[PDB]
Write an enzyme that holds these catalytic residues in place. Sequence first.
Site, short mmCIF file in Angstrom:
data_model
loop_
_atom_site.label_atom_id
_atom_site.label_comp_id
_atom_site.label_asym_id
_atom_site.label_seq_id
_atom_site.Cartn_x
_atom_site.Cartn_y
_atom_site.Cartn_z
CB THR A 37 -0.89 0.11 1.21
OG1 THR A 37 -0.05 0.09 2.37
CG2 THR A 37 -1.95 -1.01 1.23
N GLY A 38 0.15 2.39 -0.25
CA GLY A 38 0.80 3.67 -0.37
C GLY A 38 -0.18 4.81 -0.22
CB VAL A 43 1.22 -2.96 -5.56
CG1 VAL A 43 1.62 -4.02 -6.59
CG2 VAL A 43 1.96 -1.66 -5.80
CG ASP A 152 12.25 5.84 -2.52
OD1 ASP A 152 12.85 6.02 -1.38
OD2 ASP A 152 11.08 5.47 -2.66
CE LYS A 154 11.43 3.20 0.38
NZ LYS A 154 10.59 4.18 1.09
CD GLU A 156 12.14 -0.07 3.55
OE1 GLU A 156 13.29 -0.08 3.10
OE2 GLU A 156 11.81 0.60 4.56
CG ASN A 157 11.49 1.22 -3.11
OD1 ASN A 157 10.38 0.87 -2.77
ND2 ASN A 157 11.85 2.52 -3.19
CG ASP A 170 7.90 3.40 -5.51
OD1 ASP A 170 7.71 4.43 -6.24
OD2 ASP A 170 7.24 3.16 -4.45
CB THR A 187 13.45 6.59 2.44
OG1 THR A 187 12.39 6.22 1.54
CG2 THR A 187 13.19 5.97 3.87
N1 LIG Z 1 6.14 -6.18 -9.04
C1 LIG Z 1 5.77 -6.29 -7.76
N2 LIG Z 1 5.68 -7.43 -7.00
C2 LIG Z 1 5.26 -7.15 -5.71
C3 LIG Z 1 5.01 -5.84 -5.41
C4 LIG Z 1 4.57 -5.09 -4.13
C5 LIG Z 1 5.63 -4.02 -3.78
C6 LIG Z 1 5.71 -2.81 -4.51
C7 LIG Z 1 6.66 -1.82 -4.21
C8 LIG Z 1 7.59 -2.01 -3.17
C9 LIG Z 1 7.51 -3.22 -2.46
C10 LIG Z 1 6.56 -4.22 -2.74
S1 LIG Z 1 5.30 -4.95 -6.77
#
Ligand SMILES: Nc1ncc(Cc2ccccc2)s1
EC number: 2.7.11.11
Lengths: 336, 20
Positions: A37-38, A43, A152, A154, A156-157, A170, A187
């Site tokens: 989420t965001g 997603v 960005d 990190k 997480e990405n 992202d 971040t």
């Molecule tokens: N192509 C993707 N597979 C899983 C996703 C969810 C996600 C999206 C952005 C950052 C972390 C996790 S996006």
Amino acid sequence: VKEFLAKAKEDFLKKWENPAQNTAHLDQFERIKTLGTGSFGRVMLVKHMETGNHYAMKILDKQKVVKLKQIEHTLNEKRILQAVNFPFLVKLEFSFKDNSNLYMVMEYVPGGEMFSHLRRIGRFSEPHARFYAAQIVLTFEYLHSLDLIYRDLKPENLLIDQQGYIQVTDFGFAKRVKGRTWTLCGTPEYLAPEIILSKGYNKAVDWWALGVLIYEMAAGYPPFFADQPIQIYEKIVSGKVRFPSHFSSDLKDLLRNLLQVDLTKRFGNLKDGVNDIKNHKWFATTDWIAIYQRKVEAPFIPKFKGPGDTSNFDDYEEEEIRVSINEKCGKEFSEF
Amino acid sequence: TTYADFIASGRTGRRNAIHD
Ligand SMILES: Nc1ncc(Cc2ccccc2)s1
């Protein structure tokens, strides 16, 4: 390399100047689960009915993007993604919009985020971290050759694929800029000093973020952390880094050059550019060609259970998709 | 330990982007 990048740019520039639009429609996909989420949507794991292919669909409520003043950033993201093509970047498959939302259908990457495995395991060995660092080094060399700043980086990405290789996701803050730029974004843990201090800045901020990443992978925590962002900022502008005693001396030296406040001294930011990094002793065992071609064995392959399995991702509360009867923000997003 | 200081801090989950 030079000749790789020359072809890459020719390729990129055609798509840059004539972006693909409207290449699917929502009703071609079966929605299954939220993978993330965001602030302007989520997603979702989705299934393409015609093919049975699974994808990750990013949905952005046009009204939310407008409110948060992210219109230009959102058009950057889509226009760049439709134009790039690299092994370590998640592919945009389709994009479209309706009255309410924007949709970006990406390749689904079922291994989840580096973040998850990094937090769970604690920290990565120097070889394990060097492996993922090299993929980022090549990715940034590709993106920066195109005048693209990423902004960005990190864990997480960074998504882990079935081969245990990284895919960068992202692009909400990526920008095509030839000179310098001023937006405060990214971040807190990962911001270069230039950004925090409202100077103009350039691609060298990506290289700094690389040093934060490498250090996080290998220590298990970031070089600058605190409970609040402003305490993190002071730590960053003081530019005082302590290394874990386990850090090899090659690693400490790379990190000293990456997390360098003085821009005339920062690796990536000098006359030899990216080769300062690639030629550093820490990377001495790295076979760059073989990383690019994916023939190095990964330190870690994700547990795979099925085409559309979702267990490598956290659970998120579902919310229905409502599409308004009236068109929202049509003019703002006409080029989307 | 720094690890212990990290684990006990409010920033060990997913970190949001900032902007503006
Ligand atoms: N192509 C993707 N597979 C899983 C996703 C969810 C996600 C999206 C952005 C950052 C972390 C996790 S996006």
